[PDB]
From Swiss-Prot:
Residues annotated as binding heme: H30, Y73
Gene: hasA
Protein name per Swiss-Prot or TrEMBL: Hemophore HasA
GO cellular component: extracellular region
SUPFAM superfamilies, sorted: Heme-binding protein A (HasA)
Biological function: Can bind free heme and also acquire it from hemoglobin. Conveys heme from hemoglobin to the HasR receptor which releases it into the bacterium. HasR alone can take up heme but the synergy between HasA and HasR increases heme uptake 100-fold.
Length: 172
């Protein structure tokens, strides 16, 4: 675990930031009979595999996120539609660019986390964890993530409620 952040948010608490990233990102809306090309997503390192999954708002068109690590998907195999693997990074920013002949990247990065070590097996599925984080995110719900963030910061004397600055010191 580590954190990099645009200086603007040095004294922002993690809860606030995400609350504001999600205020604008919205609910991409990935539900039965609504999943089209817009909510799609799109990996990098396969068609349902990769070191990156990254979607962008289908509401303001620009703000987005990108989960790194090792994320194997499972479109229809038991269990149905359920991301899993080794979620390692999450970075929040605006304007998502790249991701084909090259990786996915954020044009104007606002914040980003590293070493989430969140592991989720295909056995657990829809009620797993990396699945939960990433999916919530795609729907504009940061709970799953602050919960796990608190988890990483517990063992550190902090919470998704301290300031980026605060979190920082206590890391590097
Ligand atoms: C890792 C990110 C993703 C997660 C966590 C995920 C999760 C899900 C979930 C929860 C639904 C359920 C809809 C429902 O039952 O109400 C959904 C729908 C769907 N997803 Fe994924 N998905 C993601 C990536 C993908 C990718 C890469 C595609 C490619 C287009 C895809 C295509 C679909 C389709 C079309 C359905 C609907 C099938 C149906 O009507 O039953 N998903 N996804
Ligand atoms: Sm812990
Ligand atoms: Zn800035
Ligand atoms: Zn912003
Ligand atoms: Zn912005």
């Amino acid at each position: 675990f580590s954190v990099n952040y645009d200086s603007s948010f040095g004294g922002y608490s993690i809860h606030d930031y995400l609350g504001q990233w999600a205020s604008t990102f919205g609910d991409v809306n990935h539900t039965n009979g609504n999943v089209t090309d817009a909510n799609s997503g799109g990996f990098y390192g396969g068609s349902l595999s990769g070191s990156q999954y990254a979607i962008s708002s289908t509401a303001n068109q620009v703000t987005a996120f990108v989960a790194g690590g090792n994320l194997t998907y499972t479109l229809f195999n038991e269990p149905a539609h359920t991301l899993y693997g080794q979620l390692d990074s999450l970075s929040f920013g605006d304007g998502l660019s790249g991701g084909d002949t090259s990786p996915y990247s954020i044009q104007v990065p606002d914040v980003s986390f590293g070493g989430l070590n969140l592991s989720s097996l295909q056995a657990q599925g829809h009620d797993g964890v990396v699945h939960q984080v990433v999916y919530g995110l795609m729907s504009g719900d940061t709970g799953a993530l602050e919960t796990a963030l608190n988890g990483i910061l517990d063992d550190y004397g902090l919470s998704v409620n301290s300031t980026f600055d605060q979190v920082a010191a206590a890391t590097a």
